[PDB]
Amino acid sequence: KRQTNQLQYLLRVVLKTLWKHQFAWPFQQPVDAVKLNLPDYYKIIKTPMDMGTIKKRLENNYYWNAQECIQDFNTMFTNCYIYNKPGDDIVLMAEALEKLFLQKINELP
Ligand SMILES: CCS(=O)(=O)Nc1ccc(Oc2ccc(F)cc2F)c(-c2cn(C)c(=O)c3[nH]ccc23)c1
């Protein structure tokens, strides 16, 4: 049986696949509430999360384990579902990314 590190797999396989997805671009940096005109965002969302922050955490030895990283991805998706209206384009984009994420995480070593 091959021994492959879970956090390494999360960086090189999982994050890489999601980052390249056509719907990844609104999730590659923190939400810019000022430019997007969402003045209530940082009041409703208490733990903001994005793939750019996850990428930095994976590169800067932040995570204790793979589950702490998985929680950051889940926070990013649920923040989107909490803030935005169902049926909004951004929600449809997050749902497609979350479906791909769950597929990739099923094959985690
Ligand atoms: C890179 C971060 S950014 O903030 O610098 N750029 C950025 C650009 C577009 C965005 O969304 C859109 C998507 C598809 C459209 F057709 C129009 C949009 F505006 C969002 C965006 C992200 N997220 C997570 C939300 O929850 C959200 N709610 C409302 C906007 C958003 C963020």
Separation of CA 42 and ligand 1 centre (Å): 14
Separation of CA 101 and ligand 1 centre (Å): 19
Residue nearest to atom 25 of ligand 1 (CA): 80
Residue nearest to atom 12 of ligand 1 (CA): 90
Report d(CA 51, CA 57) in Å as an integer: 10
- Expressed as residue numbers, the domain containing 39 is 1-108
Residue 54 has a CB neighbour count (10 Å cut-off) of: 25
Q: 26 CB less than 6 Å from ligand 1?
A: yes
Burial class (CB in 10 A: 0-12, 13-18, 19+), 5: exposed
The answer to whether the beta carbons of residues 28 and 51 sit under 8 Å apart is yes
What type of residue is 35? K
DSSP 10: I
Report d(CA 48, CA 68) in Å as an integer: 15
Q: 80 CB less than 6 Å from ligand 1?
A: yes
What type of residue is 68? E
Instruction: Indicate the SS3 state at residue 54.
Output: helix
- Please indicate the experimental technique that yielded this structure: X-ray
- In the chain, the number of structural domains is 1
Q: Is 61 left (phi over 0), alpha (psi -120 to 50) or beta?
A: left
Residue 42 token pair? 């940082």
- What's the CATH code of the domain at 74? 1.20.920.10
First and final CA of the chain: distance in angstroms? 10
Those residues whose C-beta lies under 8 Å from the C-beta of residue 101, and which sit 6 or more positions away, are 14, 18, 73, 77
C-alpha torsion sign, points 61, 62, 64, 67: negative
Residue 80 token pair? 């989107």
Residue 29 token pair? 């940096």
Q: 77 CB less than 6 Å from ligand 1?
A: no
